[PDB]
Each structure stands twice: as C-alpha cells, then as structure tokens.
Design a protein around this nucleic acid. Structure first.
Ligand SMILES: [Mg+2]
Ligand code: NA
Ligand SMILES: [Zn+2]
Ligand SMILES: [Zn+2]
Ligand SMILES: [Zn+2]
Ligand SMILES: [Zn+2]
Lengths: 162, 162
DNA sequence: TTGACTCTCTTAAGAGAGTCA
DNA sequence: TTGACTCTCTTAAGAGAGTCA
C-alpha cells in the first residue's frame, strides 16, 4: 500500500511465509562443465499455498493483503521489488527467475528487469561459461546449446549474397 | 496436392521476386569486437510489395500463388523451406532471421528451426564471440550484453539461503 | 488469378482483475 | 478477512485464413 512502512511490512510478511515453503535442492549446470547447487523455496502444487497466496494460472500466483480495509494484490514474484522503479527505458520491469523454476519464490533467485532481459537468460552460457549479465546468472540457461535447426540458409538460384 | 516440381516452381518465383527487392547494406557486430556486413533484401514498407506478396500484419506478410485454380498461401519467410520437414522434436519449425531484420526476405539470412531456437539467437554473442549454434549465427544478437537489470536478488531478513 | 486490405492465433517468459464462500 | 477458484492481457519472436473486386 501507499506508505513505505506498509510496503516493508508487505515485503516482510511475504518473506516470512515464503520462508516456510519447502526447500528443494536443485543441482544445476553452471557452464564450463561445472555444476552448482541452488535451494529453491517452492510454492505448493495445490491449495493451500500459504497465507496470502492464491493461484491465478497453471504457473501463476498472486499475493494479497488487506491494508486500510482495502485488498492490495500483486503478482507473487513481484513483492520483493515493490520499492523499485516499475519500468526501465520505457519497458515494464518483470520478476525474472535466475533459477528457471516458476514455483520458486526465493528472492535470492529473483531479479527485476525487462521482459527481454528476463527471456534472454534462458540461453545464457552461465556464470562459469561466459555469462555477461551485470546481475549475474545463477546457472546456465536451460535452452543454451547448439539448437536443432532443420535447414540453414540456402538459395536455388544466383540472386542473393550474404 | 502440389508436386515436388510445383513446389520448386513456387520457390523459384519467390526468389525471382525477392531478388528484386531493394538490397540494403548493413554493418553489424559479429562478436569479439569485430564488425561485418550483411546485405538484406527488404520488402517495401507499403503496397505494392512485389508479385504474390501481401501484408497481413504490421511486420507480417504472406506469399500467394494460384495453381490449377487453387489458391495456395504461405507465410512470406517460409517459402525457402517448403521442401523441408515442418517440425522437429515435436516443435513446429519457424523461419528465423539470422540478420534480425524482419522485412528482410534474403533466404541466405533465414533458417528453419523451433521458435525457442529462433528466439535464442537474439542473445547470441555472435560468430566471432562464441556462437555455439550448429547452424551458425551471421551476427551478434541485438540483445546480447550486460542487460539493464533494475534490482538483483536480495532479502530483508535471514529466511533464505541461495 | 491477383492485390490490398481485414481478422484471429502460437509460444513461453511474464501480468491484472472478478466471482464466490 | 482470507481462501480458492475463474477470466483475460503483454511481449516479441513467430503463424493461418476471409472478403472483395
Ligand atoms: Mg525468466
Ligand atoms: Na528471430
Ligand atoms: Zn529457485
Ligand atoms: Zn547470464
Ligand atoms: Zn537480412
Ligand atoms: Zn549463435
């Protein structure tokens, strides 16, 4: 809600509740042939999820609190960033999973960045494979690799040059 | 429906028309601080676009040919790949711009791959910067770089470990 | 047969808001 | 007040199909 105190209280309640989610260890590729370990705090698969939480889509949740007798509601991963600018360079800021695990609500696995920056982490080589993200990746992106291209660039005639 | 020979004739007519589009020379980053040059064959901004071509969206076009009294229509960048498999790994193949120039129809700037592979090229460091795509990128992706993350991972208390 | 428009849809990273109990 | 559901929307890489002359 409006006041900084009220916002901090929302952030504190969220952290306390998410802090009680089951902690699931995930071993992950870091790039460079190295492996690391992340501890994700995973929202339950089905209700009840935790005080203040409700599922609005297959892998979407919202956090809600009653402040000043009014309901305030946010996307479940946006809460850590309520005191941050909500846009950058004219682009909406989004909660971005460094662990690539939607159910995870560990704020140490989230950043706040444009949707393009967010998406791009899916292909990052990772913190030991050449990640250049200024806010560093925690793991190699799940889609990094050579790809599975069916056909490359080609022409039948002689009308084109690279 | 259409025979192999008829499909080849469609590809040949498409190439002849696209070959007459304006050819625009672009200097592009290759990765590793190197610069290169791409020659894009750009569909016009407004009608007429070329024989067989029509705009179905702000940056979407289709190619249409009528064969033996039947109208056939394809996405304008899919024509080079009409003799290729249309899916891989259970994913639909899509036309992917190696030059990241949507108006470009140069078939030497296109490949045919899953939408995830396609998207991922936006963040590739490029053919001189570490590209690992088996069908190699022609340039560094436009979104490669440190990003513009507004806020990184953080917590107010001690409820979480990474 | 052709051109120039019209419309809605897919995907996977993300969102906001309403209906009931 | 809190919980458990429902619905549609955004973005930027991509699509198919209808109408009229
Ligand atoms: Mg993400
Ligand atoms: Na692309
Ligand atoms: Zn996590
Ligand atoms: Zn990274
Ligand atoms: Zn091009
Ligand atoms: Zn590449």
């Amino acid at each position: 809600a409006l006041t900084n105190a009220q916002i901090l209280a929302v952030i504190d309640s969220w952290e306390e509740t998410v802090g009680q989610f089951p902690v699931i260890t995930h071993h992950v590729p870091l790039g460079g042939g190295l492996q690391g370990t992340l501890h994700c705090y995973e929202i339950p698969l089905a209700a009840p999820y935790g005080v203040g939480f409700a599922k609005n889509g297959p892998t979407r949740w919202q956090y809600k609190r009653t402040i000043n007798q009014v309901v305030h509601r946010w996307g479940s991963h946006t809460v850590p960033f309520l005191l941050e600018p909500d846009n950058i360079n004219g682009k909406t800021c989004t909660a971005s999973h460094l662990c690539h695990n939607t159910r995870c609500h560990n704020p140490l696995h989230l950043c706040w960045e444009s949707l393009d920056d967010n998406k791009g982490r899916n292909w990052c080589p990772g913190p030991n494979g050449g990640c250049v993200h200024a806010v560093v990746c925690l793991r190699q992106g799940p889609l990094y690799g050579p790809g599975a291209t069916v056909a490359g660039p080609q022409q039948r005639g002689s009308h084109f040059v690279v």
